[PDB]
């Protein structure tokens, strides 16, 4: 449940990349082949969290999707509400240098995603450093996912 101490939400906007995950969804231990980099864009919202813009490539056209990162009370925790799941999920930035990385720790609060849980890998470029990929498996290993649940996602 750590989030990041003395979290400086200004410098973790801009643009990241989703360069790895890890979750106890039993549909990624089989649909991660598929899985690609993804670019977001994490931009201040109205109520003092965040929008979280990425984008990903469907044959000819690339598709944008919007988060909004509610506040969670704590600076770096946030709460996000899925409409088509019926859930809410927590969010918190566990670890940032605001310049290199993130890792990100998503539990289901409320809901029948409740049980859900994901470890992700934010990276300022598109390849990530072999010393940043060890960091992120060890988070998963402290967060309990098993390696092949541990998926580093291709450019
Ligand atoms: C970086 C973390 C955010 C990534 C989300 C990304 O924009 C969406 C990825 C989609 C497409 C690529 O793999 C499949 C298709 C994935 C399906 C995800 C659907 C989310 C629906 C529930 C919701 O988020 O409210
Ligand atoms: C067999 C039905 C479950 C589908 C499996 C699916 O890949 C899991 C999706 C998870 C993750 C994405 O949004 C959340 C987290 C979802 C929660 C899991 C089941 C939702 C069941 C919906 C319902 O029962 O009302």
């Given at each position: 449940?750590?989030?990041?101490?003395?979290?400086?939400?200004?410098?973790?906007l801009?643009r990241?990349?989703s360069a790895?995950?890890?979750?106890?969804?039993?549909?990624?231990?089989?649909?991660?082949?598929?899985?690609?980099?993804?670019?977001?864009?994490?931009?201040?919202?109205?109520?003092?969290?965040?929008?979280?813009?990425?984008?990903?490539?469907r044959?000819?056209?690339?598709?944008?999707?919007?988060?909004?990162?509610?506040?969670?009370?704590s600076?770096?925790?946030?709460?996000?509400?899925?409409?088509?799941?019926?859930?809410?999920?927590?969010?918190?930035?566990?670890?940032?240098?605001?310049?290199?990385?993130?890792?990100?720790?998503?539990?289901?609060?409320?809901?029948?995603?409740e049980?859900?849980?994901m470890?992700?890998?934010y990276?300022?470029?598109?390849?990530?450093?072999?010393?940043?990929?060890?960091?992120?498996?060890?988070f998963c290993?402290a967060?309990?996912?098993?390696?092949?649940?541990?998926?580093?996602?291709?450019?």
């Open positions: 449940v750590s989030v990041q101490p003395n979290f400086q939400q200004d410098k973790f801009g990241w990349f790895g995950l890890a979750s106890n969804s039993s549909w990624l231990r089989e649909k991660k082949a598929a899985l690609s980099m993804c670019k977001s864009v994490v931009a201040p919202a109205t109520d003092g969290g965040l929008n979280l813009t990425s984008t990903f490539l044959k000819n056209q690339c598709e944008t999707r919007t988060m909004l990162l509610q506040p969670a009370g600076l770096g925790s946030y709460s996000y509400r899925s409409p088509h799941w019926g859930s809410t999920y927590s969010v918190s930035v566990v670890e940032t240098d605001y310049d290199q990385y993130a890792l990100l720790y998503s539990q289901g609060s409320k809901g029948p995603g049980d859900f849980r470890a992700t890998l990276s300022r470029t598109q390849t990530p450093r072999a010393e940043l990929k060890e960091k992120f498996t060890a290993k967060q309990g996912f098993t390696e092949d649940t541990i998926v580093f996602l291709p450019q």
